[PDB]
């Protein structure tokens, strides 16, 4: 006898969930101005929410980046987090698609400046786009950020997600520890708010966390100021 495979495509907790079932092309556009130093970044690549894998290459189109690439990692698509089967009802990010969401952040670099960011994460055709505006203020010209004193890496840690039922959104407050070349640590305090763009129903989650692992690299044949970024993200913190 011969063997045959048949299987249902499955249950979907949201309509938007289905839009991340395969590999999805990503486009990232950033418009920066830190202490008056204007810059623009453009990233392209793909996201695979099935495995929680992002692969992107970011290029500074304005020339040399005034800030270190690791300070931009958090700003430069949480919809590509792998939500295990028992947690699919807690995926706000995919549920807000295709119309997308607004992501706002205040990043406070301890004893240095602050980044204010506003981004629109949504589908434009089959491409998931993250279009951002970042404004940086009160930075030390000889600090770890303007003086590029940070190592080219990004530490793996847990971001805790909480609901914002009154704003029909999501909130997250987490710290980032950037390694300084001398041996010290530069802390970056993240305060986040996500709100849907559309008027459709959204999946509001119970408290949980996102575990993320990042690898920063350089393309050998790339003469422009760039960053090749690899990420692995998984949702956890809610039991069966």
């Amino acid at each position: 006898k011969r063997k045959r495979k048949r299987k249902r495509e499955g249950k979907l907790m949201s309509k938007g969930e289905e839009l991340f079932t395969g590999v999805v092309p990503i486009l990232v556009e950033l418009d920066g101005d830190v202490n008056g130093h204007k810059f623009s970044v453009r990233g392209e690549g793909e996201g695979d929410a099935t495995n929680g894998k992002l692969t992107l290459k970011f290029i500074c189109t304005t020339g040399k980046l005034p800030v270190p690439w690791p300070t931009l990692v958090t700003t430069l698509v949480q919809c590509f987090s792998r939500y295990p089967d028992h947690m699919k009802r807690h995926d706000f990010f995919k549920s807000a698609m295709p119309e997308g969401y607004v992501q706002e952040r205040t990043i406070s670099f301890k004893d240095d400046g602050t980044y204010k960011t506003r981004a629109e994460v949504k589908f434009e055709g089959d491409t998931l786009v993250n279009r951002i505006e970042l404004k940086g203020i009160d930075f030390k010209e000889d600090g770890n950020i303007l003086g590029h004193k940070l190592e080219y890496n990004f530490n793996s840690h847990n971001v805790y997600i909480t609901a914002d039922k009154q704003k029909n959104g999501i909130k997250a407050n987490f710290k980032i520890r950037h390694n300084v070349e001398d041996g010290s640590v530069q802390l970056a305090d993240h305060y986040q708010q996500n709100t849907p763009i559309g008027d459709g129903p959204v999946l509001l989650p119970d408290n949980h966390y996102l575990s993320t692992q990042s690898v920063l690299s350089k393309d050998p044949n790339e003469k422009r100021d760039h960053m090749v970024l690899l990420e692995f993200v998984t949702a956890a913190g809610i039991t069966h």
């Binding site: 011969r2 045959r4 249902r8 499955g10 979907l12 309509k15 079932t21 459709g200």
Partner: protein, 285 residues
Amino acid sequence: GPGSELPQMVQQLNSPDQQELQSALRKLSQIASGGNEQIQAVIDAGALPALVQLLSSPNEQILQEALWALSNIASGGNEQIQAVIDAGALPALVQLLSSPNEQILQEALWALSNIASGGNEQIQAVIDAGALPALVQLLSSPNEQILQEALWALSNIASGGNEQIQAVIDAGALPALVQLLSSPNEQILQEALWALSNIASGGNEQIQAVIDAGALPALVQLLSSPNEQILQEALWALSNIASGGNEQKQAVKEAGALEKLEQLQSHENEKIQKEAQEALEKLQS
């Protein structure tokens, strides 16, 4: 989880005002997202004909919710897939494969992949609704997601009876399928291997149609794959194709898979070692 104001919701599904219809549809759809016990409660309340009538709604947000609710219902048991078929949802689902809204098309395909994961009579119902000419078209789509759901749908229809396999063959899925064996994306590749393995599990003629489409050289190239799943699948397809006549075995030999099958016996894998010894023994008769 379980509500108790469901009959009033089905009555609100046929409301002349758009807002009280959308509220009833939103709450009723979330109930269908739950367990198989919850899917029964929505069927038993008679929500199905109202949701089917909503598949011809000129509002995209109503259409998208009706369609999402119905695909979750079809993700239930075989009698719940039947309830969807019986409610007449199939012709409306096949018409939605021509939607200019990609999200609605995707939602329609996923609903179809679910229905075609049911019994052979339910697979035939899909064929009769005429989904095959549309799914073969979607195989040329530049949209990776459309291509995945169309291959998942076709792979299910091809797990049916040999006349149902022939329905897929006569719809001309084979050239598009053999083209997809070279594809860079791992998932769509695993799916093309899935659909072809099912077509290759049919009668000797259907096994020959796969060979005639030029599947054999591509399949031999997948035996030298690093991915253990494509390796496993490339040989499932190779074993199924070997189950034919002496002409369906000699075609495999002529492709060059002989020396390739011999090496996969010294492989470190335990599942692939037993799959290889079960494959070459079938080829020597």
